[PDB]
CSV table of C-alpha atoms (C1' of nucleotides) and ligand atoms in Angstrom, one decimal:
chain,number,residue,atom,x,y,z
A,1,UNK,CA,110.4,86.8,141.9
A,2,UNK,CA,112.2,89.2,139.5
A,3,UNK,CA,110.3,91.3,136.9
A,4,UNK,CA,111.5,89.9,133.4
A,5,UNK,CA,114.4,92.0,131.9
A,6,UNK,CA,113.6,94.9,129.6
A,7,UNK,CA,113.1,93.9,125.9
A,8,UNK,CA,112.8,97.0,123.7
A,9,UNK,CA,110.7,96.7,120.4
A,10,UNK,CA,109.1,99.1,117.8
A,11,UNK,CA,105.6,97.6,118.3
A,12,UNK,CA,103.9,100.7,120.0
A,13,UNK,CA,105.1,102.8,116.9
A,14,UNK,CA,103.9,100.1,114.4
A,15,UNK,CA,100.5,100.1,116.2
A,16,UNK,CA,100.3,103.9,116.0
A,17,UNK,CA,101.2,103.9,112.3
A,18,UNK,CA,98.7,101.1,111.7
A,19,UNK,CA,95.9,103.2,113.4
A,20,UNK,CA,96.6,106.2,111.0
A,21,UNK,CA,96.6,103.9,107.9
A,22,UNK,CA,93.9,101.3,108.9
A,23,UNK,CA,92.0,102.5,112.0
A,24,UNK,CA,89.8,99.3,112.2
A,25,UNK,CA,92.7,96.9,111.6
A,26,UNK,CA,94.8,95.0,114.2
A,27,UNK,CA,97.9,92.8,114.1
A,28,UNK,CA,98.9,89.2,115.3
A,29,UNK,CA,101.9,88.8,117.6
A,30,UNK,CA,103.9,87.0,114.8
A,31,UNK,CA,103.0,89.8,112.3
A,32,UNK,CA,104.4,92.3,114.8
A,33,UNK,CA,107.6,90.1,115.1
A,34,UNK,CA,108.0,90.5,111.3
A,35,UNK,CA,107.4,94.2,111.5
B,1,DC,C1',113.2,68.5,56.9
B,2,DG,C1',114.2,73.5,56.6
B,3,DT,C1',117.3,77.0,57.2
B,4,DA,C1',119.9,79.6,60.8
B,5,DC,C1',124.2,80.0,61.7
B,6,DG,C1',129.5,79.4,60.9
B,7,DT,C1',133.2,80.1,57.6
B,8,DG,C1',135.9,82.7,54.5
B,9,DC,C1',136.7,85.9,51.3
B,10,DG,C1',137.2,91.2,49.7
B,11,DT,C1',135.9,96.1,51.0
B,12,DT,C1',135.3,99.7,54.5
B,13,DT,C1',135.7,101.7,58.8
B,14,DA,C1',137.3,103.9,62.9
B,15,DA,C1',140.1,102.3,67.0
B,16,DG,C1',144.5,103.1,68.7
B,17,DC,C1',148.5,105.5,68.9
B,18,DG,C1',151.5,109.5,70.0
B,19,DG,C1',151.4,114.1,70.3
B,20,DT,C1',150.0,118.8,71.5
B,21,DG,C1',147.3,122.4,73.7
B,22,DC,C1',143.9,124.2,77.2
B,23,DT,C1',141.9,124.6,81.7
B,24,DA,C1',138.1,122.4,84.8
B,25,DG,C1',138.2,121.0,88.9
B,26,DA,C1',140.5,117.7,92.2
B,27,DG,C1',142.5,118.3,96.2
B,28,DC,C1',145.5,120.8,99.5
B,29,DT,C1',146.2,124.6,103.3
B,30,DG,C1',144.8,127.6,106.9
B,31,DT,C1',141.2,129.9,109.5
B,32,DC,C1',137.3,130.1,112.7
B,33,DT,C1',133.0,128.9,114.8
B,34,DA,C1',128.6,126.2,114.5
B,35,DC,C1',127.6,122.0,116.2
B,36,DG,C1',127.9,117.8,118.6
B,37,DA,C1',129.9,115.3,122.8
B,38,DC,C1',129.6,115.2,127.7
B,39,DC,C1',127.4,116.1,132.0
B,40,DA,C1',123.9,116.5,135.8
B,41,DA,C1',119.3,116.9,137.1
B,42,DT,C1',114.5,116.1,135.9
B,43,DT,C1',110.5,113.4,134.7
B,44,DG,C1',107.3,111.2,131.5
B,45,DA,C1',107.3,107.6,127.7
B,46,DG,C1',107.4,102.9,127.5
B,47,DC,C1',108.3,98.8,129.9
B,48,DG,C1',106.3,94.3,132.2
B,49,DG,C1',102.5,92.6,134.3
B,50,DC,C1',97.6,91.6,134.3
B,51,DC,C1',92.8,91.1,132.9
B,52,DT,C1',88.8,90.8,129.2
B,53,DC,C1',85.9,89.8,125.7
B,54,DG,C1',85.5,89.6,120.6
B,55,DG,C1',88.1,87.7,116.5
B,56,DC,C1',88.9,83.7,114.5
B,57,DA,C1',89.8,78.7,114.4
B,58,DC,C1',87.0,74.7,113.8
B,59,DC,C1',82.9,72.3,112.8
B,60,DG,C1',78.8,70.6,110.2
B,61,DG,C1',75.7,71.3,106.5
B,62,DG,C1',74.4,72.8,102.2
B,63,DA,C1',75.3,75.2,97.6
B,64,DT,C1',78.4,75.2,93.8
B,65,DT,C1',82.0,74.1,90.7
B,66,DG,C1',84.8,71.3,88.1
B,67,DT,C1',86.2,66.5,86.3
B,68,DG,C1',85.8,62.2,83.8
B,69,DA,C1',83.2,58.5,81.7
B,70,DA,C1',80.5,57.0,78.2
B,71,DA,C1',77.9,57.6,74.0
B,72,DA,C1',77.5,60.0,69.7
B,73,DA,C1',78.6,63.3,66.3
B,74,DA,C1',82.0,66.1,63.2
B,75,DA,C1',86.2,65.9,61.0
B,76,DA,C1',90.4,64.8,59.5
B,77,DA,C1',92.7,61.1,58.0
B,78,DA,C1',93.9,57.1,55.6
B,79,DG,C1',94.0,53.5,52.2
B,80,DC,C1',91.8,52.4,47.9
B,81,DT,C1',90.6,53.1,43.0
B,82,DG,C1',90.8,53.6,37.8
B,83,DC,C1',91.9,57.1,34.5
B,84,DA,C1',94.6,60.0,32.0
C,101,LIG,CA1,93.9,105.1,105.0
C,102,LIG,CA1,113.2,74.6,62.0
C,103,LIG,CA1,137.0,123.8,95.1
C,104,LIG,CA1,101.5,95.3,127.0
DNA sequence: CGTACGTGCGTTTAAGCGGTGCTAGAGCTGTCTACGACCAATTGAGCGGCCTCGGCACCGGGATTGTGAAAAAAAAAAGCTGCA
């Protein structure tokens, strides 16, 4: 087909900050949208 | 029904005005280079795609908490007295 066009986001940085602050805590897709 | 506000006086206060005198600092000019744009080549961070397995949604069952009804007490409340 085509590979879907590139959509930048902050979500890898949010996940990295979350793992410093709450190592045993994750985040729903919506939550990450809000972030 | 109780009194906080609005009105209207006389007394007091300091804003406003116009002026002067002093200089902090706003803002302008000219110089020079540290810093940011631009570029080309390099490459690794982050993208999409994909797979998985554990959190969490949902369920049923039981424990727990809170509500309302009725009956019965506690209490204020009300109408009812003669006196003074
Ligand atoms: Ca912490
Ligand atoms: Ca009152
Ligand atoms: Ca100056
Ligand atoms: Ca991904």
